Write a protein that binds this DNA or RNA. Sequence first.
RNA 1: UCUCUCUUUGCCGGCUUAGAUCAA
Lengths: 626, 200, 43, 50, 48
Amino acid sequence: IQKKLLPITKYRNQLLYAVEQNQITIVLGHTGCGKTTQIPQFLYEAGWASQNGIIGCTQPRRLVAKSVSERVSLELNSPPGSLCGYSIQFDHNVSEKTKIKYMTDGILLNEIFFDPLLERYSIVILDEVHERTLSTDLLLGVLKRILEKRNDFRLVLSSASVDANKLSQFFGQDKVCTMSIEGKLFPVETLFLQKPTENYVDSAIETVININSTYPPGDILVFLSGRKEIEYCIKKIEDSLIHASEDCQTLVPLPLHAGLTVDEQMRVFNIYDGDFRKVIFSTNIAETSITIDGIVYVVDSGFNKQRIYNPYTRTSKLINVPISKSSAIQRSGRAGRTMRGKVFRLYTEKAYSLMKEEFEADILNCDMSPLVLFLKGLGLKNILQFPFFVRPPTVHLMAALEDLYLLGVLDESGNLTDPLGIQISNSFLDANISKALLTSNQFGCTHEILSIASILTAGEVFYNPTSSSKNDAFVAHSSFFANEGDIITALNVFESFVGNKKDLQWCRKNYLNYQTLRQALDIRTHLVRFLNKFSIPTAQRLPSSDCSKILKCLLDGFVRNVAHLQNDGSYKTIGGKQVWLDSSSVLHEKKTPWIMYSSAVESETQIFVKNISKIESFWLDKYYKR
Amino acid sequence: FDLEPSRINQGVPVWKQEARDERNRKRFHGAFTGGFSAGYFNTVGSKEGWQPKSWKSSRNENKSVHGMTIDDIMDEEDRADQELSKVYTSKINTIDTSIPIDDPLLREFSNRDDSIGEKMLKNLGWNGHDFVISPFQGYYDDTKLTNQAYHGIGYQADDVFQLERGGFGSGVLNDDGIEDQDIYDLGAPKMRYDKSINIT
Amino acid sequence: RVKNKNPAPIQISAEQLLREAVERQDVAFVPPKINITDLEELQ
Amino acid sequence: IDMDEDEKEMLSEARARLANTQGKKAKRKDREKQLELTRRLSHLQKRREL
Amino acid sequence: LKGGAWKNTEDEILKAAVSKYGKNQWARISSLLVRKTPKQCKARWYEW
RNA sequence: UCUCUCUUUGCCGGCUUAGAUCAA
């Protein structure tokens, strides 16, 4: 019944006709209208998956992929995984009988790498391509090529942004139809300031207070730059509650950002009975995949935080940028789902006249070193031959290529060097981390490096409470403080983690993130299969306590990321960069003479390093001399 | 060595951290570390003592009398700072890093620091003639523009409100003031001075 | 909902503070009395 | 009714402060007397068990 | 940070601290209230 | 005159520049 209520039912015949008669179809629509969930059902009913055919619909988000797969399996009244399944990066839950497949972009790139022509799929629908992920756009570039070779293969493009004309030019107008669905949205009136604001949160708090006292009940969703102002708004909203008048509703503030624990992110969905008005202080999470109902009034600051990587310094910084035009329309239209709502963007239309229309792709805002490995593995000598939708900056490509050359994966001619280069190309991870695993075979200690890599890719394995439990967390970790750095501390924690019977109460007691450890287990299992692809045994352990050769492999893996202490308390990277140690690391003030890190995060004044591990100079000298 | 009990630090950053304790005691040691005692106990010697080893030279017995080495005469501070003071070589890192080349003027005069990378571009068949740039570089300009200062989008700001020799030290606790600047001044020649002024 | 801004029916008073602070005291420390079983410890 | 939670912390500290009295380093002498009493009791108990 | 609006608990702790300490030990009284300064405690006592 | 209880019941560390200072 819910299938039939969606607006997409009335386009079924038209969508099928366009998809069949056109090699590539561009579908424009709003999230939640049924494009994500009902297009697979519609073409399965048409018969696209008939006779061994498979429906591979790409969902670039792992959680979204799994959730949509489960929803489609349940909506078709079929056992999970039988007809519809999900395949996310380093986690496979599929079956031979599965017809509707929701898959991640990286695995699909790997399948292209092994199978250049995708003979097992007759149709693939690209969904949620609006986020412009690196993997998504690389997949689009390769997919134009496969449509070039394959006349039977069909493409359906679903996007929440108006990019069809550029895609139409890129794909050729004679083979793409630009169709737009006519949804329904309650009319939303925009309100703009006559003069530019000086302090947008103070402008925001003024409007938030004015909405409560003068407008009918309804939750107000705000848009703020980042998580630092969220608590600031909590404090003023609490003070306003203390001084609230009898004519104003009890206004509850609710944070919503990426760094929260899931339960905190579940706190927002709670229903507050009585005269309680929710206000969600969301940075940018309440923009996609969030469907909180009852949102009426939205005040938009026009600023959003994002990430930029610096190739010259190999750093990454969180900077504030004015939002794009598309984001402004999405923010205005978010309010008004259930009833009429108004938006208050804290700037003037003259300010709107100047922002750039659409945010740049992550293929243009991420690390391209994994991308070059992909093209070189496919066999593309000249990177310029690949059909990029937007030309990536050449200097970034050159930074990645010089990094790969000094890494040894590329020769003087720029081609993959020895089995090392191809084996690195076969690895999902970055070339830097994979080198330690691949060189561990010469030394018979792959296991501890495998655990290190799994911990690094899975993420942070320690939990730091914000309450008084910080001392308790510190004491719980106090048993496993390694003199040699966090990396061997992580190794000890990983070794003893499996030694405590996978007890979840033990993980809680020791403030250890069990989820990260499980994900590391899946990563290491898949990398074991990856090494066995090269017939490398994975029973190799070092029986001796000397972690020195593990450190040789790591220094071979983090050649560039070394630094030594300066008198001023900072460290000089080998590349002449002034960095400061992060407070989280154990070796905060030990004044270790020589240090080695993995990742660098840069703030407006200090460049901070993570994953701190001590080293000795003569190892570096002997490694550099050869 | 048990790294001492680490729970003592907890949070409480620098300006409330008690004092450094060499042996869990509040006391400095060393002449240049703030202690009123240096050496063993204001002395050169050690607890056990020190004796030279026996010497015998007969063109075959001095062969057992080898030479002297760096480590055999240093102590733990000296070795620690010997490890700290070792910085050299580098080479390969310096050749392929930093700023290779950009903008047409620099291509002509400034040497391409890319070097072997120019041959790599030969592998890519660059053939750029006129170079190609991407809007990320306009965002790379944002690395040299601002990070915003909590202001609105349309806020024009103001121009009056933006702002940005040696010897021994007066003492790290003795602070700075009008007293501690260079009385001998010849800096800021012209960057702070205009070249012309409107007369009307 | 831990947002009961409603003023408390029992407001905190100073005399309450001093009373409940003093309440931390207990009876005088009771030591087990020494038993003089012979003459020398009596001496 | 629940005036957050840091106020409870400061209230507890204030309650401990207002009735603490007895100076600051007068806590050493009474403790030393208690320890001497314990040690003399142990000596006497050892003598009687002998 | 510092300052605020002098919640009733703060006022009551101020009254008790003046009971126990006196009117000439405002720093010692303000040690009880983390969120307030000796000048602020003296100002409230002499103004409200 | 005993016993218990209550009530009346006059009652039994110093000095100095507050010694000097104080942000999670």
